[PDB]
Each structure stands twice: as C-alpha cells, then as structure tokens.
Amino acid sequence: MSWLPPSNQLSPEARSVLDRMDAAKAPEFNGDLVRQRAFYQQFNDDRLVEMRRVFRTRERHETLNAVHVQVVEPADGVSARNRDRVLINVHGGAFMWGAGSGALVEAIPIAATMGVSVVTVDYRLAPENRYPAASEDVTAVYRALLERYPAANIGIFGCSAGGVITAQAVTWIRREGLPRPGAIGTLCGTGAPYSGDSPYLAGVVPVGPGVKAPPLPGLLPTAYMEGVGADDARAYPLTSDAETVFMPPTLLLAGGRDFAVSALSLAHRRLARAGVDSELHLFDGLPHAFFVWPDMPESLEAYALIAGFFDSRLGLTP
Amino acid sequence: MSWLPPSNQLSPEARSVLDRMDAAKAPEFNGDLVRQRAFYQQFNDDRLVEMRRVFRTRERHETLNAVHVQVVEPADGVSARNRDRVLINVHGGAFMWGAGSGALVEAIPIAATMGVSVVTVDYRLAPENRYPAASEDVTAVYRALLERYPAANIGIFGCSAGGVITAQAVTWIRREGLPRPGAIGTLCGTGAPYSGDSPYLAGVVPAPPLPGLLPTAYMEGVGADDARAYPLTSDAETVFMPPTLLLAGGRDFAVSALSLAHRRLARAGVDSELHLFDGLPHAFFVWPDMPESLEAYALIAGFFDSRLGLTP
Ligand SMILES: [Cl-]
Ligand SMILES: [Mg+2]
Ligand SMILES: [Mg+2]
C-alpha cells in the first residue's frame, strides 16, 4: 500500500516492474466483457513478448480427451531427469480470460527453467461456463496424461484463478477415482476464499480513516463460483479437513503484497496439521501474480522455487 | 493497522488475547533500563503464571560448561519418542531481559507439547555484555549436551532476540569446530536485520528507510559484513545452516525478514519451513490461552520431531 516505500528487499529491476505494473492498471470496464477481454488480451500478449525474450521454448497445440492444450517444451529439449515427468498448467485470468497467451505466459518460464514438458489447459471460462467446468477440463487432461506418465510424476500448477482450479481439479480427480497427482502448485490462490488481513492491505476491499470496513465474504465472488456453497468441500477443499488430508504435496507462493497471502498462510497451516508436505514462499513487496513479469531477478527466483518443488516431489521412473 | 478489523481467521480466544496484549503494552521509559527491566520481569512472571496453568512441567537448575541453564521437562518425564533428543531454548527479551521467567515461558510449552527435555540458556545480556557473549554461552551449553546427545538429535530454538541468537550460535558452533545441530527454530527473528514492508505495517516505524543492522546495544559496533553475526544475509553462512523453522505472526515486524531468509535457505538447498499466523503480532505464542498458540507449539514440535535424529 501507498504510504510505504518499495520493499527494501527488491532488486532495481523489480522496483521498475512495480512502477510499470501500477501504470498498466486496468481502467473500469463497467461489465463490458468484450472490452475487458481485449484489455487482458493485450496485457497477456505484452507479457508473452517479454517471456519470449528471456526463454527459448517450442509450443505445440494438442487435444486431450476433447480438451484443447498447448504443450510447451524447452527449445533445448526436456532434461533426461524429466523424461518421464509432466506438468499441467492451469492459467489465471479471473476465471474469464487468459486463454492462449496468458496460458503460455505461465507455462513458458516453468518449462524452460525446470527443463520439462508443460501441458497448459484451455479450460472453459466464466461467465459462459460455471463450476465445475474447469475442474472437468483439467481432470480430462490429467486422465489422458496418465496413459503416458505415472500419477506420481505428474504435477499440476496455476496462478491466481489457476491456483484455485488446480486445488479444485485435485478433488475432481479424487471424485473420478483416479490416482492423485504427485504434487501441485497453488500459486497466488487456492481452493479457499480470500480471508484475513491481506485483502484489506492490497486494497481489494477499501479501508482507512472514516471507513466502516466490511467483513470479507466466505465465498470467492467470481461468477464462476456463484451459487456454490461454502460447504462444498470439492469447491473449497482447503477449508475441508477431509479434502485437505487427501491433497498431494503442495507449493503455495505469493507476493508479500498479494491479497491472496493471508489465505495461503492459513492453507499452509491446515496442510501441515493434516500431515501434507507443503511449502510456502512469500516475496516481500510484490503483488498478486508478480511472476508473469519476467524482467526481474525475483521472477527467475520464483521459477526456480517452482521447478525445485516439482523436481524434489515428483517421481522419476517410467 | 488501526483501520483494519482483526483478522477474520482468528479464534474468539485470540481476539481476547489481542486486547490483553494491548493492555500489557509498556509505557515510555525514556531509556530508564531499571524501570524497563522491572516492567518486563512482571510481564514474563505474568505469562509464566498462564504457562503453569496450561502445561504440567518440572524445572531443574543445572550448570553446563560454566553456563546456568534451566532444564524443563514434562512433569511425568520425557516421551519415549524423545528419549535421545534435547532442545536448547534461547529466550527473547530485546537482548536485555527475559532471564528466568522469560526463558521458562518459551521452554515450558515446547517441553510439554513435544514431550522433550528443553535446556533454556541463561546467556549474558546487554548492555553489560555485547556480541558474541550470548553465542559463546549457547555454544558452551551445546558442547556439554554433545556428551549425552548426538548433534543430529539436538535442536536450538528461540523467539525474537532468541531467534537472532539461535542463528548466531549456529555460526559460533561452526567456528568452534563442533558438529552442527540437527535443526533450529528462528522464531520471530533470525540472523538478519528487520527489512522489507512488515516493520512499517507493524507500526514500529512511522516514511524513512530501515536500518541494515539490528539497532540493539548487544550488536553495537558489529559490522554488516560479519557473516557470523548476520548469517542469513551471507550466501556462504546460509549454505551451512541446518534445517530451519521460521515462524511469526502475520502482523509481526519480523515477517518480511523471515520470508526472505526462507527464500535464501531454499535457494541454498537447506531444508526450511515457514509458517505465518495471520492477524497476530510479534512473539504471540508467549500467550498460551488461544488455539493459535497451541497450534504454533504443535508446529514447533512437529518440525523438530521430523528433522531431529532418533539414534542413541
Ligand atoms: Cl514452508
Ligand atoms: Mg513439512
Ligand atoms: Mg524444501
């Protein structure tokens, strides 16, 4: 928030990115979905230009069990170590955009940094489609990849809305009776509402002098989730002791100034108490989804933590 | 943070503790160290009463290599799980107080929750003593414990100033040529200055830049370059750290330093774990009357239970 100086931990590069992130903030769209989607198409294309400058990858289109995916590989080839591994990426974009370039923006840095194949899923978006459409889509992709890869060697990750869907996909996979994935990354978001202090600090809910700050909702406000109960453990698994016990090893990663931080710190407590192997990282001073901007050492550092989590937690053998 | 509601994650018991914490806040002492020490003696005696009502432990005084300790155990004895393990506690208290009751306030909940022997160190305090006096004292106790316990089965933990001294003791043990401890807990502080956003949000600053050193008399005249004094800022010292638990309240001025320490340990390939308790301040877990404190004690116990060895 505005009274503070930039975190004194940030690289000069990051301080530059923060100025541009603030300057690049969306105008009010007033329900004009077409104008909103155009804005974020340009945003995602802009970050993809930055990704392609830093990383060397090759992308193919594929269809797996009637779901459209992009398969992103390092241009140098997958490492020997990762021959029998694969990651599924679930893009962010507020459950309403991010298809195509936003999906590549999340898949490219991980494919290149880990030296692994990343299958980024073109799941059904809101407002046209509702929960559990995205869960069904990611589970269909997962089901296809089990023909080629052991469950223990498959990771699933996503940023923001993609972190929410990654957690929801886990429960849908269990509902289908499939073996659970080897590990997941619930980045800047998980299967829980936003809670705690961080939504107030990040300015998602206004606070200050003369302001009667309201309580926070116990549901994600997106149309994708409208009408889904708090008590649906498959929709909100990190609030459910039962679905939390069944989670695979989980990475939770956020910027320090991300409205998601308080929810992820509580989710990590719950996973620890449930006996699940989880890891939490916070990058002080950085906002929600900071690692879609690759021109700072902090983003490369995040890609290394994501790669290192999967490299440690996923199985290797065919 | 006056414009914020209490974190909606907190138990009703925690919301009560928040009000008790505010009632218990120190007045301005204007550098009168005697009045300050008297206030914190009373503070620590008050938390000790709370600890004694919640947990059943026995405390013994011992001397190990000329350093005074209290040995804190569950009243009916250490668990079979922990027969070949011991923790060293290093108390907080701004490097100037916390001796005796402060030390028991950190040792009792962990001894009782884990079912383990906790040896809490009566280290030399500022301003009478300066760095590296406390590192020397903790290392002397560690040296004595190696007579009975494998290095891999010894943990060291402390809160606030004690978390700082824990990290500094690690480097001192290495300087002495001893085997490194099995695991440490750098709770609400580590071998690094307070940095990042959290000191501003916690309101321990009104904005100006932050210091690159710890401002305490204990550290006066120690350089930033002393990697033994500030190991979590040194790439070299960080690689040699043992498995580390970092834990703080979400509103603690230590949060940002610990998140960076955790990133540094991960990059260095050290096993580390971070937990943050949304809505709680610095050293929250000296107040045992809330589920969140019991939960913190269980994370501390779980970390040492997973990372310490079991061989005799
Ligand atoms: Cl962690
Ligand atoms: Mg663990
Ligand atoms: Mg690790």
Author numbering:
A (entry chain B): 15 to 332
B (entry chain A): 15 to 220, 227 to 332
Reproduce, without paraphrasing, sentences from the article in which this PDB structure was first reported.
The unique feature of this enzyme is the presence of a cysteine residue in the GCSAG motif which surrounds the conserved catalytic serine. Both of them had a typical α/β bacterial HSL-like fold, consisting of two canonical domains ‒ a CAP-domain and a catalytic domain. The active site of PMGL2 consists of a catalytic triad of conserved His302, Asp272 and Ser174.
In order to reveal the structural features associated with this new sequence motif, we have crystallized the wild type PMGL2 (wtPMGL2) and determined its 3D structure. It was the third structure of an enzyme from the GTSAG motif subfamily established and the first one with the GCSAG variant. However, these residues were not disulfide bonded in wtPMGL2 structure as followed from the electron density. In wtPMGL2, Tyr208 residue has two conformations of its side chain with relatively poor density.
